[PDB]
From Swiss-Prot, chain A:
It is found in: Cell inner membrane. The periplasmic linker component of the MexAB-OprM efflux system that confers multidrug resistance. Functions as the major efflux pump for n-hexane and p-xylene efflux. Has been shown in one study to be involved in the active efflux of the autoinducer N-(3-oxododecanoyl) homoserine lactone, thereby playing an indirect role in quorum-sensing; but has been shown in another study not to be involved in efflux of this autoinducer. Over-expression of the pump increases antibiotic and solvent efflux capacities. Implicated in the secretion of the siderophore pyoverdine. The chain holds residues 126 to 177 of 383 of the full protein. Belongs to the membrane fusion protein (MFP) (TC 8.A.1) family. This is Multidrug resistance protein MexA. Disruption phenotype: Disruption of MexA, MexB and OprM significantly reduces active efflux of N-(3-oxododecanoyl) homoserine lactone/3-oxo-C12-HSL/PAI-1, but not N-butyryl homoserine lactone/C4-HSL/PAI-2.
Amino acid sequence: DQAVSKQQYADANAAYLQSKAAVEQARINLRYTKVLSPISGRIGRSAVTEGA
Amino acid sequence: TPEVGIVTLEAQTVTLNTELPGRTNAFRIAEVRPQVNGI
């Protein structure tokens, strides 16, 4: 109903997509911990035990 | 003739354990590294 400018909407939508990208960066850092095995195969011993 | 001790041997089953060298490592070792700085 055009109660706000179109440009103020474009600024709000840009801030919204920038913040979604910042949450994606924080989620990628939260996914690097709890480290995923990149491939599938036989795994050996753990050179780093838990606690190090 | 000589009389000597003679055994009568027969078949049986065995287990065949093999000896192999090595060291013992600790189960859960944690080197206390600081993660933060200062004296």
